[PDB]
Amino acid sequence: PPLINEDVKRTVDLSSHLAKVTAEVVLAHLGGGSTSRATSFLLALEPELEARLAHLGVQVKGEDEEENNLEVRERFFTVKLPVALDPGAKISVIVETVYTHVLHPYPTQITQSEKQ
Amino acid sequence: DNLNVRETHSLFFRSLKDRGFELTFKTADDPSLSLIKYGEFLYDNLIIFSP
């Protein structure tokens, strides 16, 4: 159950009027003990953008989408893997999120013949 | 005007700072000088001692 992510590549798209960030994260399980449980893995969000989330989705290898349950820890999202991983195996997961109302216009008062 | 004027006007500026203002001294001909930046008014009070 204690595991780390080996390589994470995240791309943020700002060319829309809403920000879409996609993170390819490879979960690896440190081979300590024979506890092969490793079923659900936590997902977290920064506090400043908590209220600005729209739709969170997880896709693996391009295959069927997994299911994520909102979770509270004494917000978080728990993700149930299809096949639990034994210690010493890597799974490639893709986390894609969309944030709405996150690009504020800075000049905030723009004439007709200007740029934004 | 000459950046040495602050020395010979010290009393006024010491009083002004003692009241609680943040004083920035520049020379009237300075390339980095501006009031608005993207419509912000980054300086709330202006003082011209440069005839």
Side-chain angles (χ1 to χ4, degrees), chain A residues 106-108, chain B residues 37-38 40:
Chain A
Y106 188 62
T108 321
Chain B
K37 187 174 175 58
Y38 304 120
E40 191 179 0

Side-chain angles (χ1 to χ4, degrees), chain B:
Chain B
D1 202 2
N2 288 320
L3 192 56
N4 86 325
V5 163
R6 169 177 50 177
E7 186 65 30
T8 188
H9 290 58
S10 178
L11 204 51
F12 181 60
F13 291 114
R14 185 185 63 86
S15 165
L16 198 54
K17 172 182 298 299
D18 202 354
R19 263 177 288 165
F21 293 90
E22 301 180 11
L23 295 174
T24 80
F25 305 97
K26 291 190 175 181
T27 309
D29 52 343
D30 200 4
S32 69
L33 187 60
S34 60
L35 285 178
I36 66 175
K37 187 174 175 58
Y38 304 120
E40 191 179 0
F41 286 113
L42 51 95
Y43 286 142
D44 289 332
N45 304 327
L46 189 128
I47 293 180
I48 300 176
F49 282 148
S50 74

Side-chain angles (χ1 to χ4, degrees), chain A residues 5-22:
Chain A
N5 35 16
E6 301 277 333
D7 168 19
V8 39
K9 306 164 59 275
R10 60 197 302 273
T11 304
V12 308
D13 294 334
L14 306 170
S15 59
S16 309
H17 62 91
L18 75 181
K20 295 178 293 299
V21 328
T22 295

